[PDB]
Enzyme design. Structure first.
Site, PDB file in Angstrom:
ATOM      1  N   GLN A  27      43.337  26.259  28.356  1.00  0.00           N
ATOM      2  CA  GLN A  27      44.344  26.740  27.419  1.00  0.00           C
ATOM      3  C   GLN A  27      45.741  26.345  27.903  1.00  0.00           C
ATOM      4  O   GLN A  27      45.927  26.016  29.076  1.00  0.00           O
ATOM      5  CB  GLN A  27      44.249  28.269  27.292  1.00  0.00           C
ATOM      6  CG  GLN A  27      44.593  29.009  28.578  1.00  0.00           C
ATOM      7  CD  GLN A  27      43.833  30.304  28.743  1.00  0.00           C
ATOM      8  OE1 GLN A  27      43.357  30.629  29.828  1.00  0.00           O
ATOM      9  NE2 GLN A  27      43.690  31.055  27.667  1.00  0.00           N
ATOM     10  N   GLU A  87      46.589  38.374  34.361  1.00  0.00           N
ATOM     11  CA  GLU A  87      47.882  38.674  34.956  1.00  0.00           C
ATOM     12  C   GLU A  87      47.788  39.785  36.007  1.00  0.00           C
ATOM     13  O   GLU A  87      48.756  40.028  36.736  1.00  0.00           O
ATOM     14  CB  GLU A  87      48.988  38.860  33.904  1.00  0.00           C
ATOM     15  CG  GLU A  87      48.826  40.064  33.008  1.00  0.00           C
ATOM     16  CD  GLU A  87      47.915  39.820  31.802  1.00  0.00           C
ATOM     17  OE1 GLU A  87      46.670  39.810  31.968  1.00  0.00           O
ATOM     18  OE2 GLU A  87      48.436  39.604  30.700  1.00  0.00           O
ATOM     19  N   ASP A  95      38.076  36.063  35.761  1.00  0.00           N
ATOM     20  CA  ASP A  95      38.816  35.282  34.781  1.00  0.00           C
ATOM     21  C   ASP A  95      38.333  33.837  34.843  1.00  0.00           C
ATOM     22  O   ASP A  95      38.081  33.320  35.920  1.00  0.00           O
ATOM     23  CB  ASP A  95      40.335  35.394  34.999  1.00  0.00           C
ATOM     24  CG  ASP A  95      41.167  35.017  33.768  1.00  0.00           C
ATOM     25  OD1 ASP A  95      41.079  33.841  33.318  1.00  0.00           O
ATOM     26  OD2 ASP A  95      41.896  35.903  33.242  1.00  0.00           O
ATOM     27  N   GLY A 122      33.108  34.704  32.107  1.00  0.00           N
ATOM     28  CA  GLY A 122      32.580  36.058  32.163  1.00  0.00           C
ATOM     29  C   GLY A 122      31.161  36.139  31.598  1.00  0.00           C
ATOM     30  O   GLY A 122      30.391  37.010  31.988  1.00  0.00           O
ATOM     31  N   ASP A 173      39.310  42.573  28.899  1.00  0.00           N
ATOM     32  CA  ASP A 173      40.717  42.288  28.677  1.00  0.00           C
ATOM     33  C   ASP A 173      40.872  40.793  28.428  1.00  0.00           C
ATOM     34  O   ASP A 173      41.515  40.090  29.200  1.00  0.00           O
ATOM     35  CB  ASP A 173      41.547  42.740  29.880  1.00  0.00           C
ATOM     36  CG  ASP A 173      43.047  42.649  29.641  1.00  0.00           C
ATOM     37  OD1 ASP A 173      43.465  42.663  28.453  1.00  0.00           O
ATOM     38  OD2 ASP A 173      43.794  42.571  30.638  1.00  0.00           O
TER      39      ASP A 173
END
Ligand code: MTA
Ligand code: MTA
Ligand code: MTA
Ligand code: MTA
EC number: 2.5.1.16
Lengths: 286, 288, 288, 286
Positions: free
Chosen positions: B35, B90, B110, B143, B163
Site C-alpha cells: 500500500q 501504528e 501486521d 493475519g 484493527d
C-alpha cells in the site's frame, strides 16, 4: 470520487466536504443569505445557506429529533412552544407531534427560506406550517423576543434552531449572555430552552461562549451531541432548564411520555436519551 | 477559507463525498509492496498516517478511536491475559491493550513492515514505546496466515482485536472480514473469549457493514454494535464486539470504573459513563 | 483520475476557476516577511516554486516563460550592455539575459531574500549558476526603492525586465505597476532603451491588464503586446514590451536568428519564427 | 475561490480544473455519453460530455474559427464539406460562412447532443442546422465514411471535430492510421483534412499517434495550437493537404479569400494565420 458537479461545503476552514450534486432546484439571493436547494447523491435533497448544508432528506431526522425531543420530553406538560429559526419547518414538525402542545410559534427572519421550503422541502415540513396549532412569524428573533417581554408572553419550551454561531452574521445577537437573559424572561418558571451550539471540536471558542451564556442564566444545563453525516460533524446541543433535569429521566419514562403524547420517531427513544445524557462531547485531544 | 489549502489532502469518504484537508508538511511518502503510505501534518488534526489516501489515525483524535476499539472489550473480559491484535500498525492499539495490568502477553500482527517502521520513526505519540514493552511481540505477517498457523499450533487468546484497513476499500484485508474467518477467530479464543473489530461505516457502506455483522453473528452468541465519531475520518466508525460468555450490556458504569482502576488503566476518553452511552446509542443508517 | 491526489495543490486562477495539481513531495515551506513560499514536486510540471498559492515557475515549462519574457526585448535592442531585472527571484530571468554576449552588467533586484536563498538551494535547473556570474549583481531590496535610488545616482540601463508577482493579486508588487512607476523606469533607461513586463492575463483579468497597458503606453512610444500559454499557470501570460526607439515589429525571423547567433544565445523555444508569431497573434479576451 | 457549486473538469489526470457553476439546464445520460449543459461564471454556458467541457459561450469562437478557417482558406474553392462530430453546430456555422460552400454534411453519432444543442446552445449553432446547404446525419462517422467509399463520394474539405483522442471510447476508431487512409479516399485530389488532436503537452503519445497517422497519408501537414481557456490547455490541430500548402499563404491572400467569400470572424485573420503557421507547439521541456 465526487463529480462532475460538486458542492464544496466549508467545515472548519482547514477541512471542507466535497459532495456530488445531481441537480439544482433553486438558487435565490435573499436580503439575508444565499439559498440553494439541491439534490445530492449521498444525502438526497438538501437546503444550503451560504454554502452550508442546513438539512438533508437522509439525515435531517437525526438532527431535528435530537434538537426537539430531549427538551420536550423533559418538560412534563409543554403547552406553549417558541421556535427561533427552523425555516424548513422540521423543528415545528417535531414539536407539534407532542399531543400536549396547544400553541407553537415559529419565528424566522427570512421569508424566502420559508417559501422555498414550502415548495421544495415537503418531507421536512410535512404540512406543519398549516397546522391550526402553529403560527409562522417572519421577523428577526431578537426583535420578536423584545416584543414578547413587553407583552409579557410566556412559553414552556423555547427551541433555537438558527444558523451557526461560528459563521452567521444574522444570528450572532441571539447567541449572547444577554439574549439568554431575555429568553429566561419569556419562559414559565419550569421552562426549558434548547439550542444548537455549532461544534465543540472544530469551534471550541464559539461553543464555550454559547455554553457560558446558557450557564449564567439557567441552573440546569445538559450538553449532548449527535453526528450528522451531511454536516461533516457532530452537532452540539445545549439544554437549559429552570426546574426539570434531563439527566433524571429514565429510558422508561421517556418512552412512556412519547407514547402518551402520540409521538412517533425514526431515531429518538429512551435508550437514545440515556446515551445522549452520558456521552461527553468531542474536543481536540492534542 | 472555503477551499482549504494551498496544499490539500483529498480523503475519499463514500465515493460521493470526500474531505479536503489542509496539509502543513509531508514527513514521508513510501510505496510499500502492500500500500501507499504517507505521514503528514494537517492543520486540523496534527500528524496523520495515511494509507491509500485514507487517514488511519491523527494525533488530535486517535485516542477516541483506539480507546473505543480496545477498552469496551478488555473491560468486558474479567481477566484478559493473552491479547492478539491483527493490524494496528501504528502501535496505538497495542498501547491501549498493554494498559490493562492483567495482560501478560500481547501479540500484534501486521502485514506491512513499512507501516510499523514509519510509525516507530514518525508517530511517537501513537505507539508511546508499546513496540518495546517486554509483554509485547510484533510479528510481520498476513493475519490470515498467522491465524491458520495458530489453529495448527492450538494457540489460544482471551481477547482478539482486529484493527485493519477498511472492509469496504482494502484488498489486503478482505479475507479477514468473512464468516469463515470469524469461525477461525473463534477457534483461537478461550471458551470465555471476546473479539472486537472495526466494521467501516453503517451509514455510507451498509452492505459491507451488514456482511461483517452477519459474519460475527453466525459465530458468536453475544454481539454488541457501537459507533464513535472520529473527526479525521469524516464519519462515525462502527465497532462490532463478539463475546462467547460475558455481556458488555451487563456492565454498570461503576463496574467499568472499578475494573479500570484495579487494572491501572488511565484514559483520555473511555469511562463507565462512556461505556453506557456506547451500549445504548443505535448506529446511524440513511433514514430516507 | 478525475480528482488529482491524494496530495494536491489548489492553485487559484480567476477566482471562478482554480487548478487542482497533484503534489509528489514538499521540499520546503517558509513564511517569509513578505509572502508564503513553497517548493514542491508536481507530477505534471516537476519542481515548482509557489508564492501565496500561485505557481511562479515549473521545471517543465519555465523556459517558455523566461525565454518569452527576456529574448524579444533583448533581441530588439541592437546592443544591450546593462540589464536591470525587478523580481526574478528564481534566477531564470537572469540566466536568460546573461546569455546575450553583449551584456556587461546585469542587476537583479528582489524584495525577498528567502526566495533567492531557497532557489539557490532547491531550483538549480532554473538559475543554472546565474547568481554567481561575474557580470551579475543580486540586490535584496524593494524594486520601488531601488529605482528611486537609481534616479538619484543617475543610473542608466539598456533593458529593464520586470518579472514580478501578478498585478491582479500581489500586494507587494502593486506600486510597480502604475503609470508613475513606468515614468520612473523611463528615467533610468538610456535613450534607446526597452522595458518589458508581464501583465497578468487579459482574458481573466482584463481590468488589471488594461491598467498596466495604459501605464506603459503613457510613457513609451512603441508598445508590443504578446502572450504565451504556460501550462503550470493555467493561462497564457501577457507581456508588454515598451521601447523608446527600436520596433520589435520590424524584426524579421532571419534578423532575430542572426542576432541570437552573433551573441551566442542558445534557447529551447525562442527563435525568429517564434518572434514573428508572438508579434502577430492577438491576445485573448472573453468574446461574449 | 470557486463554489459553492463546482464542476471538476479532468485535464491530465494529474491536473483538473475547478469551475464555478451558476446553474444546470440539462442532464442526460445518452446511449453514448453523459451530457450536461450548465452556466459557468467564467465561461458562460457550456456543453459537457463525460466531464469535459466541449465548448463555452465565451471562448468557443477561438476553437471553431481555429479548427475551420485555416483549412477552408487553404483550399482555393471548397464546395463540398464533411464534418465528423461538431454536435453543437458551431463547426457547421463556421464552415457555412464560406460563400463557395454548396453542400455541408455534419455527421454526429449522438442524437441527444444535437437535440440538446438545438434547445440550449443557440449562440453556438445560430440556426446552422436549418441552412438549406446543410445536412445533419446521425450516424457513427466510421460507418458513414465506409459507406461514402462504397458510394464513391468525394469532399473538398473534411473537418474532424470529435471528442478527444486521449479519453473518448466512441471516437477512438476515427483517429487511426487506417481511418486517415479512408479519409484520403473520400477527398478530391486537391482536398484537405483538419482534425483536433488533443494536447501535445499533456498527451504527447496520443498526439504523436494522430500526427503519424496523418503524415502517413498526406504529403503536406501543418500543426498549430490555440489556447482555449475553458479546456485548460492549448488545443492542437493537424491539417493534412493533398496539394495546397497553408504555409504558402500570405496574410493578404488569407484576408482576400475571407473577404471574397463573405466570411466574418471574431478572431481569425491573415495575421492570425501567419502566427498559427509559425508558432511551434508546446511539449514538456524537461
Ligand atoms: C434553515 S434553519 C436556520 C434558520 O435560522 C434563520 N435565522 C438566522 N438568523 C436569524 C434571526 N436573527 N432571527 C430569526 N431567524 C434567523 C435563517 O433564516 C434560517 O432559515
Ligand atoms: C494502520 S492500522 C491498519 C493496518 O492493517 C494492516 N493490514 C491490512 N491488511 C492486513 C492483513 N491481511 N493482515 C495484517 N495486517 C493487515 C495494514 O498494514 C495497516 O497497518
Ligand atoms: C518568483 S519571481 C517574482 C518575484 O517578485 C518579487 N517581488 C514582488 N514584489 C516586489 C517588489 N516590490 N520589489 C522586488 N521584488 C518583488 C517576489 O519576491 C518574487 O521573488
Ligand atoms: C460536441 S462535438 C464532439 C462530438 O463528437 C461526437 N462523436 C464522438 N464519437 C463519434 C463518432 N465515432 N462518430 C461521430 N461522432 C462522434 C460526439 O457525439 C460529440 O457530439
Amino acid at each position: 470520487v465526487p463529480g462532475p458537479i460538486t458542492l464544496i461545503e466549508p467545515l472548519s476552514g482547514n477541512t471542507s466536504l466535497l459532495i456530488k450534486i445531481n441537480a439544482i432546484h433553486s438558487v435565490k439571493k435573499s436580503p439575508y443569505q444565499e439559498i440553494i436547494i439541491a439534490d445530492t447523491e449521498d444525502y438526497g435533497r438538501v437546503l444550503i445557506l451560504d454554502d452550508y448544508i442546513q438539512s438533508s432528506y437522509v439525515d435531517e431526522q437525526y438532527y431535528h429529533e435530537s434538537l426537539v425531543h430531549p427538551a420536550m420530553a423533559t418538560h412534563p406538560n409543554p403547552r406553549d412552544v417558541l421556535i427561533l429559526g427552523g425555516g424548513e419547518g422540521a423543528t415545528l414538525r417535531e414539536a407539534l407531534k407532542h399531543g400536549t402542545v396547544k400553541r407553537a410559534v415559529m419565528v424566522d427572519i427570512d421569508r424566502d427560506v420559508v417559501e422555498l421550503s414550502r415548495a421544495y422541502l415537503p418531507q421536512m415540513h410535512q404540512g406543519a406550517f398549516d397546522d391550526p396549532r402553529a403560527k409562522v412569524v417572519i421577523q428577526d428573533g431578537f426583535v420578536y423576543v423584545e416584543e414578547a417581554i413587553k407583552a409579557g408572553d410566556k412559553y414552556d419550551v423555547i427551541i433555537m434552531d438558527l444558523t451557526d454561531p461560528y459563521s452567521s452574521d444574522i444570528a450572532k445577537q441571539l447567541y449572547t449572555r444577554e439574549f439568554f437573559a431575555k429568553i429566561r424572561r419569556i419562559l414559565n418558571d419550569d421552562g426549558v430552552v434548547v439550542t444548537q451550539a455549532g461544534n465543540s471540536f472544530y469551534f471550541p471558542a464559539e461553543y464555550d461562549m454559547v455554553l457560558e451564556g446558557v450557564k449564567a442564566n439557567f441552573p440546569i444545563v445538559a450538553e449532548y451531541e449527535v453526528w450528522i453525516p451531511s454536516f461533516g460533524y457532530a452537532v452540539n446541543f445545549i439544554l437549559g432548564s429552570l426546574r426539570y433535569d434531563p439527566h433524571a429521566l429514565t429510558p422508561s419514562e421517556v418512552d412512556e411520555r412519547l407514547r402518551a403524547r402520540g409521538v412517533k420517531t425514526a431515531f429518538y427513544t429512551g435508550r437514545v436519551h440515556l446515551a445522549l445524557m452520558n456521552m461527553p462531547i468531542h474536543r481536540k485531544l492534542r
